[PDB]
Coordinates of C-alpha atoms and ligand atoms in Angstrom, one line a residue:
Chain A
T1 CA 51.7 97.4 93.5
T2 CA 53.2 100.0 96.0
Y3 CA 50.4 98.5 98.8
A4 CA 51.7 94.8 98.1
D5 CA 55.4 96.1 98.4
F6 CA 54.6 97.7 101.6
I7 CA 52.6 94.8 103.1
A8 CA 55.8 92.4 102.0
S9 CA 58.3 95.0 104.1
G10 CA 59.8 94.7 107.6
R11 CA 58.0 98.0 108.3
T12 CA 54.2 97.5 108.7
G13 CA 54.6 96.6 112.6
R14 CA 54.8 99.2 115.1
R15 CA 58.0 101.7 114.7
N16 CA 60.2 102.3 117.4
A17 CA 61.6 106.0 117.5
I18 CA 65.3 106.8 117.0
Chain B
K8 CA 43.0 136.6 104.9
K9 CA 42.7 138.4 108.4
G10 CA 39.1 137.8 110.2
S11 CA 37.0 138.1 113.0
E12 CA 37.6 134.1 113.2
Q13 CA 41.1 134.6 113.2
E14 CA 40.9 137.2 115.8
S15 CA 38.6 134.7 118.2
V16 CA 41.6 132.5 117.7
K17 CA 44.1 134.8 118.9
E18 CA 42.2 135.8 121.6
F19 CA 41.4 132.0 122.8
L20 CA 45.2 131.1 122.5
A21 CA 46.4 134.1 124.7
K22 CA 44.4 132.9 127.5
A23 CA 45.6 129.1 127.1
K24 CA 48.9 130.5 127.1
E25 CA 48.1 132.4 130.6
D26 CA 46.8 128.7 131.9
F27 CA 49.6 127.4 130.5
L28 CA 52.6 129.3 132.0
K29 CA 51.2 129.3 135.6
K30 CA 51.3 125.2 135.6
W31 CA 54.7 125.6 133.5
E32 CA 56.2 127.8 136.2
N33 CA 54.9 125.6 139.4
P34 CA 54.5 121.7 138.2
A35 CA 52.3 119.4 139.9
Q36 CA 54.4 117.1 141.7
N37 CA 53.9 113.9 143.8
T38 CA 49.7 113.9 143.5
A39 CA 49.3 110.1 144.4
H40 CA 51.3 107.0 145.4
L41 CA 51.3 103.4 143.8
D42 CA 49.2 101.7 146.1
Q43 CA 46.3 103.7 145.5
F44 CA 46.0 102.0 141.7
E45 CA 45.2 98.5 140.9
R46 CA 47.4 97.3 137.8
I47 CA 45.4 95.3 135.5
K48 CA 46.9 95.0 131.8
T49 CA 49.8 96.2 129.7
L50 CA 48.5 98.2 126.9
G51 CA 51.5 99.4 125.4
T52 CA 55.6 99.3 125.6
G53 CA 58.4 101.4 124.8
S54 CA 62.2 101.6 125.5
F55 CA 60.6 104.0 127.9
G56 CA 59.4 101.0 129.7
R57 CA 55.4 99.9 129.8
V58 CA 52.0 101.8 129.9
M59 CA 49.2 99.9 132.1
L60 CA 45.6 100.1 132.4
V61 CA 44.9 100.6 136.1
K62 CA 42.3 101.1 138.5
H63 CA 42.1 104.1 141.1
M64 CA 40.6 102.2 144.1
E65 CA 39.1 105.2 145.5
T66 CA 37.0 106.5 142.7
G67 CA 36.7 103.2 140.9
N68 CA 38.0 105.2 137.4
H69 CA 40.3 103.6 135.1
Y70 CA 43.5 105.1 134.1
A71 CA 46.6 104.4 131.9
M72 CA 49.6 104.1 134.0
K73 CA 53.4 105.1 132.3
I74 CA 55.7 103.4 134.2
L75 CA 59.5 104.1 133.5
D76 CA 62.5 102.6 135.2
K77 CA 64.8 105.5 136.2
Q78 CA 68.0 103.5 135.6
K79 CA 66.7 102.9 132.3
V80 CA 65.9 106.4 131.4
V81 CA 69.6 107.6 132.6
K82 CA 71.3 104.6 130.6
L83 CA 69.4 105.5 127.4
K84 CA 70.3 109.5 128.1
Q85 CA 66.8 110.3 128.2
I86 CA 66.6 112.4 131.5
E87 CA 65.9 115.8 130.0
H88 CA 63.3 114.6 127.5
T89 CA 61.6 112.8 130.5
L90 CA 61.2 115.6 132.4
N91 CA 60.4 117.9 129.5
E92 CA 57.4 115.0 129.2
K93 CA 55.9 115.2 132.2
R94 CA 56.5 119.3 133.0
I95 CA 54.9 119.7 129.6
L96 CA 51.9 117.2 130.1
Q97 CA 51.0 118.4 133.4
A98 CA 50.5 122.1 131.8
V99 CA 48.8 121.7 128.9
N100 CA 44.8 121.4 128.4
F101 CA 43.1 120.9 124.7
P102 CA 40.7 118.8 123.6
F103 CA 42.8 116.5 121.6
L104 CA 45.6 116.0 124.3
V105 CA 45.5 113.2 126.7
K106 CA 45.2 114.6 130.7
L107 CA 47.7 113.9 133.1
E108 CA 45.4 113.1 136.2
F109 CA 48.6 112.0 138.6
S110 CA 52.2 111.8 138.7
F111 CA 54.9 110.5 141.5
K112 CA 58.0 108.6 141.9
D113 CA 59.5 105.8 144.2
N114 CA 63.0 104.2 144.6
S115 CA 62.8 102.7 141.1
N116 CA 60.4 104.3 139.1
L117 CA 58.5 107.4 137.7
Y118 CA 55.0 107.3 137.3
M119 CA 52.6 109.4 135.0
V120 CA 48.6 108.4 135.3
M121 CA 46.7 109.2 132.4
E122 CA 43.1 109.3 131.2
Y123 CA 42.4 105.8 129.6
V124 CA 41.6 106.1 125.7
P125 CA 39.6 102.8 125.3
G126 CA 39.3 102.8 121.5
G127 CA 42.9 101.6 120.6
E128 CA 45.7 103.0 118.7
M129 CA 44.7 104.7 115.1
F130 CA 47.7 102.4 114.0
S131 CA 45.9 99.3 115.0
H132 CA 42.7 100.5 113.0
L133 CA 45.0 102.1 110.1
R134 CA 46.7 98.8 109.5
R135 CA 43.5 96.2 110.0
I136 CA 41.5 98.7 107.4
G137 CA 44.1 99.3 104.9
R138 CA 43.4 102.8 104.6
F139 CA 41.0 105.6 105.6
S140 CA 38.8 107.3 103.1
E141 CA 40.1 111.1 102.5
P142 CA 36.6 112.4 104.7
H143 CA 37.9 109.8 107.4
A144 CA 41.4 110.8 107.0
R145 CA 40.3 114.8 107.2
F146 CA 38.7 114.1 110.5
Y147 CA 41.7 113.1 112.0
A148 CA 44.0 115.4 110.4
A149 CA 42.1 118.6 111.2
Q150 CA 42.4 117.6 115.2
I151 CA 46.1 117.5 114.3
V152 CA 46.0 120.9 112.5
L153 CA 44.2 122.4 115.9
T154 CA 46.7 120.5 118.2
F155 CA 49.7 121.8 116.6
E156 CA 48.1 125.4 116.3
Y157 CA 47.7 125.1 120.3
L158 CA 51.0 123.5 121.1
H159 CA 53.1 126.0 119.0
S160 CA 51.3 128.9 120.5
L161 CA 53.0 127.6 123.7
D162 CA 56.6 127.3 122.2
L163 CA 56.3 124.0 122.1
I164 CA 57.8 121.4 119.5
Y165 CA 56.2 118.0 119.4
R166 CA 58.4 115.6 117.4
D167 CA 56.4 112.3 117.9
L168 CA 53.6 112.1 115.7
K169 CA 52.5 108.7 114.2
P170 CA 49.3 106.5 114.2
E171 CA 51.3 104.4 116.9
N172 CA 51.0 107.9 119.3
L173 CA 47.2 108.9 118.4
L174 CA 44.4 107.0 120.2
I175 CA 40.7 107.0 119.5
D176 CA 38.6 108.2 122.2
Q177 CA 35.0 106.7 122.8
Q178 CA 33.3 109.1 120.8
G179 CA 35.8 108.3 117.8
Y180 CA 37.9 111.7 118.5
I181 CA 41.8 111.7 118.5
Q182 CA 43.5 112.0 122.0
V183 CA 47.5 112.6 121.5
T184 CA 49.2 110.3 124.2
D185 CA 53.2 110.4 123.5
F186 CA 55.1 113.4 125.1
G187 CA 58.3 111.8 125.2
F188 CA 60.1 113.9 122.7
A189 CA 57.8 117.4 123.1
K190 CA 60.2 120.5 124.1
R191 CA 59.6 124.0 124.7
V192 CA 62.0 126.0 122.9
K193 CA 62.1 129.2 121.1
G194 CA 64.9 129.3 118.8
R195 CA 66.3 126.3 116.7
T196 CA 66.8 122.8 118.2
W197 CA 69.4 120.1 117.1
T198 CA 68.3 116.8 118.9
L199 CA 68.1 113.9 116.5
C200 CA 64.9 112.2 117.3
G201 CA 61.4 111.0 116.2
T202 CA 60.5 107.8 113.7
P203 CA 62.5 107.4 110.3
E204 CA 59.2 107.5 108.0
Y205 CA 58.5 111.0 109.6
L206 CA 61.3 112.9 110.0
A207 CA 62.0 116.1 108.2
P208 CA 64.6 116.4 105.5
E209 CA 66.1 119.1 108.2
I210 CA 66.6 116.5 111.3
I211 CA 68.2 114.0 108.9
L212 CA 70.8 116.5 107.5
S213 CA 71.7 117.7 111.4
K214 CA 70.6 121.5 110.7
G215 CA 68.9 123.4 113.7
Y216 CA 65.5 122.8 113.0
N217 CA 61.9 124.3 114.4
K218 CA 58.1 123.4 114.7
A219 CA 58.4 123.3 110.8
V220 CA 59.6 119.8 111.5
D221 CA 55.8 119.1 113.0
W222 CA 54.1 120.1 109.8
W223 CA 56.1 118.0 107.2
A224 CA 55.1 114.9 110.2
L225 CA 51.9 115.9 109.5
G226 CA 52.1 115.5 105.8
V227 CA 53.3 112.0 106.4
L228 CA 50.7 111.2 108.6
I229 CA 47.9 112.7 106.2
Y230 CA 49.6 110.8 103.3
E231 CA 49.9 107.6 105.5
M232 CA 46.0 107.5 106.3
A233 CA 45.0 108.0 102.9
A234 CA 47.4 105.7 101.0
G235 CA 47.7 103.1 103.7
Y236 CA 51.2 103.1 103.4
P237 CA 53.7 105.8 104.2
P238 CA 55.5 108.1 101.4
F239 CA 58.7 107.2 102.2
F240 CA 59.5 103.5 102.9
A241 CA 62.1 100.7 102.5
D242 CA 63.5 98.0 104.6
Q243 CA 66.0 100.0 106.5
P244 CA 66.1 103.6 108.1
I245 CA 69.0 104.6 105.7
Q246 CA 66.9 104.0 102.5
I247 CA 64.3 105.9 103.9
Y248 CA 66.6 108.8 104.6
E249 CA 67.7 108.8 100.9
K250 CA 64.1 108.9 100.1
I251 CA 63.3 111.8 102.3
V252 CA 66.3 113.9 101.3
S253 CA 65.9 113.0 97.7
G254 CA 63.0 115.7 96.9
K255 CA 60.5 113.0 95.3
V256 CA 57.2 112.2 96.4
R257 CA 54.7 109.8 94.4
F258 CA 50.7 109.5 95.2
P259 CA 48.4 106.8 94.7
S260 CA 46.2 107.2 91.9
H261 CA 43.1 107.5 93.9
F262 CA 44.3 110.8 95.8
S263 CA 42.1 113.7 95.1
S264 CA 43.8 116.9 93.4
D265 CA 43.3 118.9 96.4
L266 CA 45.2 116.2 98.5
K267 CA 48.2 115.9 96.4
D268 CA 48.2 119.7 96.3
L269 CA 48.1 119.8 100.1
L270 CA 50.7 117.1 100.6
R271 CA 53.3 119.0 98.0
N272 CA 53.2 122.1 100.4
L273 CA 53.2 120.0 103.3
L274 CA 56.0 117.3 102.0
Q275 CA 58.1 120.3 100.6
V276 CA 61.9 120.3 101.3
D277 CA 62.3 123.9 100.9
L278 CA 61.6 125.9 104.3
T279 CA 60.3 129.0 103.0
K280 CA 57.6 127.1 101.0
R281 CA 56.4 125.0 103.8
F282 CA 52.7 125.3 104.8
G283 CA 52.7 125.7 108.2
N284 CA 56.0 127.8 108.0
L285 CA 55.0 131.1 105.8
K286 CA 53.8 134.5 106.9
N287 CA 50.4 133.1 107.2
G288 CA 51.2 130.3 109.5
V289 CA 48.5 127.7 110.2
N290 CA 46.1 129.4 108.0
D291 CA 47.6 128.3 105.0
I292 CA 46.7 124.8 106.0
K293 CA 43.3 125.5 107.5
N294 CA 42.3 127.5 104.4
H295 CA 43.6 124.9 101.8
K296 CA 40.9 123.5 99.5
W297 CA 40.9 120.1 101.1
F298 CA 39.8 121.4 104.2
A299 CA 37.0 123.5 102.7
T300 CA 34.2 121.3 104.0
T301 CA 35.8 121.5 107.6
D302 CA 34.4 123.7 110.3
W303 CA 37.4 124.2 112.6
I304 CA 34.7 125.4 115.5
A305 CA 32.8 122.3 115.2
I306 CA 35.5 119.7 115.4
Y307 CA 37.2 121.8 118.3
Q308 CA 33.8 121.6 120.4
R309 CA 33.4 117.5 119.0
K310 CA 30.1 118.2 117.4
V311 CA 31.1 116.5 114.2
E312 CA 29.5 112.9 113.9
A313 CA 32.9 110.8 114.1
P314 CA 33.3 108.3 110.9
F315 CA 34.3 105.6 112.9
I316 CA 33.2 104.8 116.8
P317 CA 35.2 102.0 118.5
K318 CA 33.6 98.9 120.1
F319 CA 33.3 99.4 123.8
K320 CA 32.5 96.0 125.8
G321 CA 32.3 98.2 129.0
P322 CA 34.6 99.7 131.8
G323 CA 38.0 98.2 131.6
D324 CA 37.7 96.4 128.3
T325 CA 41.0 96.6 126.5
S326 CA 39.9 94.9 123.1
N327 CA 41.2 97.5 120.9
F328 CA 44.6 96.8 122.2
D329 CA 46.9 93.9 121.6
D330 CA 48.3 91.5 124.4
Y331 CA 51.8 92.1 125.7
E332 CA 54.0 90.3 127.9
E333 CA 53.3 91.3 131.9
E334 CA 56.1 91.7 134.2
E335 CA 55.8 92.4 138.3
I336 CA 57.2 95.8 139.2
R337 CA 60.0 95.7 141.4
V338 CA 60.7 98.9 143.9
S339 CA 63.9 98.7 145.0
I340 CA 64.9 99.5 148.8
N341 CA 67.4 101.8 147.7
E342 CA 66.8 105.0 145.8
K343 CA 67.9 105.4 142.4
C344 CA 68.9 108.4 140.4
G345 CA 67.3 110.7 143.0
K346 CA 69.0 114.0 141.8
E347 CA 68.5 113.3 138.3
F348 CA 64.8 113.4 138.6
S349 CA 64.6 115.7 141.6
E350 CA 61.7 118.1 140.3
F351 CA 59.7 115.2 138.7
Ligands
15I1 C1 45.3 104.1 126.5 N1 46.8 103.7 126.1 C2 47.8 104.5 126.2 N2 48.9 103.9 125.8 C3 50.1 104.6 126.0 C4 50.7 105.1 124.7 C5 50.8 103.9 123.6 C6 52.0 102.8 123.9 C7 53.3 103.7 123.9 C8 53.2 104.2 122.2 N3 52.3 105.0 121.8 C9 51.1 104.3 122.2 C10 49.3 103.1 123.8 C11 49.1 102.6 125.0 C12 47.4 105.6 126.7 N4 48.4 107.1 127.3 C13 47.4 107.7 127.8 N5 46.4 107.2 127.7 C14 46.2 106.1 127.4 N6 44.9 105.2 127.0

């Protein structure tokens, strides 16, 4: 599922600005 | 289309602009000193430095104090952005914008003392719960819509909308806390700034852009609140940018017809078609079907019962925030970067 792909990604934590 | 309601909004905004300009042209400066506050605990960090819960001894009030190291701001080429942040925050006044109470500087650092918002970041609640129901996301979204209507009327562009930069107050309402990329600009601007997931295509493509980038970012926020994940995600920023520019978006099957329609108009690559950027401005958003149940005045007046009230143990409680590594403040005996931050 898209949710499972999101949860397994390295971008579920706080995201830094560019 | 045009009504008495829109006329009352116009009148309110004209007076809000009069108030803003007085403060914008004559900024408050050096209104406290570091020794007037007891430093308790770190609430959050950034490349900017850290934000700590503090107690003002004279009143016993708790505040959130942002500490920026002047040398780090210079190395990161964020001098102008830091001067913008404080000049703007001291001049604004809206129910969903955190108040700046005091600001000052010493040999080493810059300091911004703001009201403490005890409910924690929307990011924390969103990730823990998974996603917000459509009425829950709508309640927060309505506050951002009003906040952007106010900010944009002052020629301000926000540029850092995300759950990590939205805090929940004791009444369950939103407090926008992060003005690091806010800028007062009448034409177009070009700075590559913001967060990968939230960037409008025109920012990625190095075009001159305007306040329409904030309306695209609202589309990203609404999607993330309602889905539990962003519309464009990947392990690396380059893969996120490829998805943003592609012109393709996919919605969860549980999204209502009205929600998808609103998001297709906000997450619109074509600027002649993006909601918030048309002849009708913010009214294309406020009058959209997804917002039919929203009473804009009741939201502004904070008369609407919030869908979620954060847990409050008492004053000074930080249970709604993650724990961070603490480091003692060191004030140099020599003034650093004095000329660069003279107006702070
Ligand atoms: C509580 N915490 C704050 N923090 C600063 C912003 C932050 C940290 C930096 C990224 N955005 C969220 C969370 C903590 C506040 N900033 C102003 N008032 C606040 N109340």
